[PDB]
Design a protein around this ligand. Structure first.
Ligand SMILES: O=c1[nH]c(-c2ccc(Cl)cc2)cc2c(F)cccc12
Ligand SMILES: [Zn+2]
Length: 208
């Protein structure tokens, strides 16, 4: 049921998505080991992901959460990087897309920093890099990230350097508490709480 609709680079939607992608790159504590060395991306394509069934599944759950949280879904737009991006856009999020060894337990992880999600495009820790060159800092191969609509509801705040949500909460927020520049990360425990709205195709760019 999924179709992908290409956005024109002249479209304001393309432009606002590209800006969120570019402006949320930061330095990482691994010095680029997992995701590569770059300060910016070359955006090749942005597509809108359209699937009526998956959208209805998302809004149904969003309404349940909202009604449990004084009519506030606490919806964010967040990045997700995964080797399973092709399954996600066709079948939605589910337990198979969880990060089992994540620091907030087995759930589905999202980032405010696009460069954090970039670390997972080729697997946990960048795996072995691109399939063609075996290079985690490959500047040639095309990568994909999802920019997703995520319902957090009442989020459990974890201050910090598929399982269940902590009782009485709909998500967990990983607040950065050592790296002063890092943005937050978030975890949901039900795949119906995210919709994969934009597929972004890009390369990381070698600093000049
Ligand atoms: O985008 C993310 N993806 C993942 C991740 C996705 C799939 C697998 Cl198989 C493992 C980790 C993990 C992750 C994280 F731990 C923090 C912030 C963002 C992300
Ligand atoms: Zn490559």
């Amino acid at each position: 049921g999924t179709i992908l609709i290409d956005l024109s680079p002249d479209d304001k939607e393309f432009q606002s998505v590209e800006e969120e992608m570019q402006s949320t790159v930061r330095e990482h504590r691994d010095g680029g080991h997992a995701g590569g060395i770059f300060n910016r991306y070359n955006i090749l394509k942005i597509q809108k992901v359209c699937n009526k069934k998956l959208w209805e599944r998302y809004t149904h759950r969003r309404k349940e959460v909202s009604e449990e949280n004084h009519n506030h879904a606490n919806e964010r737009m967040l990045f997700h990087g995964s080797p399973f991006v092709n399954a996600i856009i066709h079948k939605g999020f589910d337990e198979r897309h969880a990060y089992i060894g994540g620091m907030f337990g087995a759930g589905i992880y999202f980032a405010e920093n696009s460069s954090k999600s970039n670390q997972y495009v080729y697997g946990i820790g960048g795996g072995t890099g691109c399939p063609v060159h075996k290079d985690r800092s490959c500047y040639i191969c095309h990568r994909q990230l999802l920019f997703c609509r995520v319902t957090l509801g009442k989020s459990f705040l974890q201050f910090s350097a598929m399982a269940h949500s902590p009782p009485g909460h709909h998500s967990v927020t990983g607040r950065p508490s050592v790296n002063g520049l890092a943005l937050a990360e978030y975890v949901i425990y039900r795949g119906e709480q995210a919709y994969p709205e934009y597929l972004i195709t890009y390369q990381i760019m070698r600093p000049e």
